[PDB]
């Protein structure tokens, strides 16, 4: 029922109610699962973006429990920070750091990155999944969206709701769980898949800072995850407009072979991230 997962849920968030610790509320997007308001912390003055999110109107329920426990245990250089969280009413608020270089998104929608850029943002995204995986996490959202800049640069790993914490007893999931384009091929076909999918999902990534959208785009969700499960891997569009070492650092990420699939790690050390630059080369992306 509502009130014994509600129950189970407080558990987990910051005790008490905390309206009367912010002012100055305004609401600045909206998500899958609710809203985004910033407030001011009337006890510091920070200024806190905050998620609210609706315990009865949700997809999976269950999935709300990502928002918190993930920041709540993971902490990293490149993963996003939890304040503080809350049950307010049927609500569940998570306050976050207000990163105001927004989404990678909204960059490559506008420009292709240059390697530079893209190298950048990868060793950014490979250190935190280097280090959720090594935890047991799998992310299983990577994409554009979910990586925020700072206005400096930083790159930083958002949008843990789809997150599965694997273990001893059950370390390996099957659901159906992610955003359509860049799910792997094991995913779409509800086989047991560990970390491995995130790399997939990041190659994917990859296509959308070179080409500025994911393969099969222009395809509805079901028809590119039929195309994602049976074809052949994708290609870049704009393939002969990258360098070699590119070109093989995207080939060891969309392997249909999970276990062959690069892992994180292995990435790290691949040359195409010596050429990494300062979070300074990617200000001119923000501006
Ligand atoms: C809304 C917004 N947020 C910005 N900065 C932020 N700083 N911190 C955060 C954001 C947005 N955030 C976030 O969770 N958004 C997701 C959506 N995904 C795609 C990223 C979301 C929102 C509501 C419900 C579910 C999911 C957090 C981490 C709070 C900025 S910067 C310039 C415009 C702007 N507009």
């Known amino acids: 029922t509502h009130e014994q997962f509600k129950a189970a849920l407080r558990m987990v968030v910051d005790q008490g109610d905390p309206r009367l610790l912010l002012d100055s509320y305004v609401k600045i997007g909206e998500g899958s699962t609710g809203i985004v308001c910033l407030a001011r912390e009337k006890h510091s003055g920070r ?56 989404a990678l998104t909204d960059i490559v929608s506008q420009v292709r990155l240059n390697e530079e850029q893209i190298a950048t943002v990868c060793e950014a995204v490979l250190q935190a999944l280097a280090y959720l995986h090594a935890q047991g ?10 990586i925020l800049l700072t206005l400096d640069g930083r790159v930083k790993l958002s949008d843990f709701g789809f997150c599965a914490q694997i273990s001893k007893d059950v370390p390996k999931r099957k659901s159906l769980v992610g955003t359509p384009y860049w799910m792997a091929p ?85 040359p195409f991230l010596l050429q990494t630059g300062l979070p300074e080369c990617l200000v001119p992306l923000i501006q």
């Open 137 to 146: 996490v799998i992310h299983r959202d990577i994409k554009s969206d979910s």
């Open 186 to 270: 094991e995913v779409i076909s509800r086989s047991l898949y560990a970390t491995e999918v995130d790399i997939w999902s990041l190659g994917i990534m990859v296509i959308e800072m070179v080409d500025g959208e994911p393969p099969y785009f222009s395809d509805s969700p079901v028809q590119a995850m039929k195309r994602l499960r049976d074809s052949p891997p994708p290609k870049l569009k704009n393939s002969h407009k990258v360098s070699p070492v590119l070109r093989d650092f995207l080939e060891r990420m969309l392997v249909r072979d999970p276990q062959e699939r690069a892992t994180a790690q292995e990435l790290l050390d691949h």
């Open 47 to 102: 200024q806190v973006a905050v998620k609210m999110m609706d315990l009865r109107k949700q997809q999976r329920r269950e999935l709300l429990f990502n928002e918190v426990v993930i920041m709540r245990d993971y902490q990293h250089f490149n993963v996003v920070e939890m304040y503080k969280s809350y049950l307010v009413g049927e609500e569940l608020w998570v306050l976050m750091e207000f990163l105001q270089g927004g």
